[PDB]
Design a protein around this ligand. Structure first.
Ligand SMILES: O=C(c1ccccc1)[C@H](Cc1ccc(C(F)(F)P(=O)(O)O)c(Br)c1)c1ccccc1
Ligand SMILES: [Mg+2]
Ligand SMILES: [Mg+2]
Ligand SMILES: [Mg+2]
Length: 285
């Protein structure tokens, strides 16, 4: 019962920011205040073709390393949210030459789920679209088979089998693909986004029994940042005595310690607030 007033305060605050048209100002404060750490490995000449965008790089301190002697580099970051007790890997959409690296990362990190928030057409077609046309990544010795998929209006869930060809171990990977979230846009609705997030949660993919979920979009910052921020803030609102004590700006700044550029537009920041308030009300209702 105590939560009613807390949610009223959150909704009032949201409405005050809307009325004043202050989302961009708050978003620019976040950009201004965001961490700046070196990305020396990302910038090595040998890695140029491993980055989709020159201007989007993983920090050295939080990058995911491939277990390779040859070249350990992938444009991917580990976001470790200590208070929420959740970790995520945020990565760019695989390139034609980094699909093997992507799946190697999924394997090595022991991930159970991949969350994709963009569409191919960018991003390489890194998973099989037909059961009978499996993919083999010869560079990393991995085989990937589409087992089934469930296509809904705003998202698709695929069951994939990932096989390490060296050991013959197989793992089930769940692919959660939100298909209606344009570059620098927002999801179809808070409801659509939350339904999707709740499906990811329900699947167990986010549990500490597994490696970190792999989340990507095109650059691995805007949509991926929005998704992870909302999830973390929802965790915190459930965990804390007072849900209104969760400061979404503060949480985003924390996440930006681990990867640059998380949340790419003022409207995405707005959306994150809206989705978190609505999701928390739902959960705590
Ligand atoms: O490379 C980019 C850039 C470079 C200098 C200044 C500003 C931006 C971004 C890289 C970038 C950064 C973020 C996203 C994103 F936000 F949409 P995401 O949700 O992370 O895929 C995308 Br798509 C792309 C860009 C933006 C528009 C067109 C092409 C490239
Ligand atoms: Mg930039
Ligand atoms: Mg068929
Ligand atoms: Mg088999």
């Amino acid at each position: 019962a105590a939560d009613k007033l807390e949610f009223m305060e959150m909704e009032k605050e949201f409405e005050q920011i809307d009325k004043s048209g202050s989302w961009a100002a708050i978003y620019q404060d976040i950009r201004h205040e965001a961490s700046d750490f070196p990305c020396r490995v990302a910038k090595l000449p040998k890695n140029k073709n491993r980055n989709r965008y020159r201007d989007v790089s993983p920090f050295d301190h939080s990058r995911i390393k491939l277990h390779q002697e040859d070249n350990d580099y992938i444009n991917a970051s580990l976001i470790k949210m200590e208070e929420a007790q959740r970790s995520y890997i945020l990565t760019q959409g695989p390139l034609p030459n980094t699909c093997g690296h992507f799946w190697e990362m999924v394997w090595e990190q022991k991930s159970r789920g991949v969350v994709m928030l963009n569409r191919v057409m960018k991003c390489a077609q890194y998973w099989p679209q037909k059961e009978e046309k499996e993919m083999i990544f010869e560079d990393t010795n991995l085989k990937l088979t589409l087992i089934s998929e469930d296509i809904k209006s705003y998202y698709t869930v695929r069951q994939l089998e990932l096989e390490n060809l060296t050991t013959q171990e197989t793992r089930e990977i769940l692919h959660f693909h939100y298909t209606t979230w344009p570059d620098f846009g927002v999801p179809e609705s808070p409801a659509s986004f939350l339904n999707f997030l709740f499906k990811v949660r329900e699947s167990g993919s986010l549990s500490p029994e597994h490696g970190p979920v792999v989340v990507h979009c095109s650059a691995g910052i805007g949509r991926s940042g929005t998704f992870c921020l909302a999830d973390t803030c929802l965790l915190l609102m459930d965990k804390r005595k007072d849900p209104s004590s969760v400061d979404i700006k503060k949480v985003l700044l924390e996440m930006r310690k681990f990867r640059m550029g998380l949340i790419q537009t003022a409207d995405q920041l707005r959306f994150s607030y809206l989705a978190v308030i609505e999701g928390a009300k739902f959960i705590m209702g």
